[PDB]
């Protein structure tokens, strides 16, 4: 309900979406899939299924994951699946 795209709640339907993903981007798709993310057909542009929150301009070390907490720390999946602690933690950083 709360939930900005339902169509793309599962794993299996994240994966799919980065069919077109440039092979040129140093994040992969499972890395992205994994932390709620999908791909939306233009540049390496994504967003999360949940709180459709953003991202792009991906670079060889960044992790979805902190990415997610660092700009988006209210969301539901996220708290979920990684816990309040790490969002703090995160959010703490910067
Ligand atoms: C994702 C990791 C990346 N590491 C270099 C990163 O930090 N990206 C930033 C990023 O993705 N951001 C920046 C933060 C600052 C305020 C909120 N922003 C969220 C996000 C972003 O720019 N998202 C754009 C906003 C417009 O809508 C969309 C839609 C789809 C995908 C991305 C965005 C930003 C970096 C500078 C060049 C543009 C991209
Ligand atoms: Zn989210």
Same mark, same amino acid.
């Given at each position: 309900? =709360?939930?900005?795209?339902? =169509? *793309?709640?599962?794993?299996? %339907?994240? *994966? &799919?979406?980065? *069919?077109?993903?440039?092979? =040129? !981007? ?6 992205? %899939?994994? %932390? /709620?993310?999908?791909?939306?057909? &233009?540049?390496?542009? !994504? #967003?999360?299924?949940?709180?459709? /929150?953003?991202? +792009?301009?991906?670079?060889? /070390? ?6 997610? %907490? #660092?700009?988006?720390? +209210? ?5 979920? *699946? #990684? ?9 703490? +950083?910067?």
């Amino acid at each position: 309900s =709360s939930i900005s795209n339902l =169509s *793309m709640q599962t794993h299996a %339907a994240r *994966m &799919r979406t980065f *069919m077109y993903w440039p092979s =040129s !981007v140093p994040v992969q798709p499972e890395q992205l %899939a994994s %932390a /709620g993310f999908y791909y939306v057909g &233009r540049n390496d542009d !994504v #967003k999360c299924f949940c709180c459709d /929150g953003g991202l +792009r301009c991906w670079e060889s /070390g960044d992790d979805p994951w902190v990415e997610h %907490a #660092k700009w988006f720390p +209210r969301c539901e999946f996220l708290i979920r *699946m #990684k816990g309040q602690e790490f969002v703090d933690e995160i959010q703490g +950083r910067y």
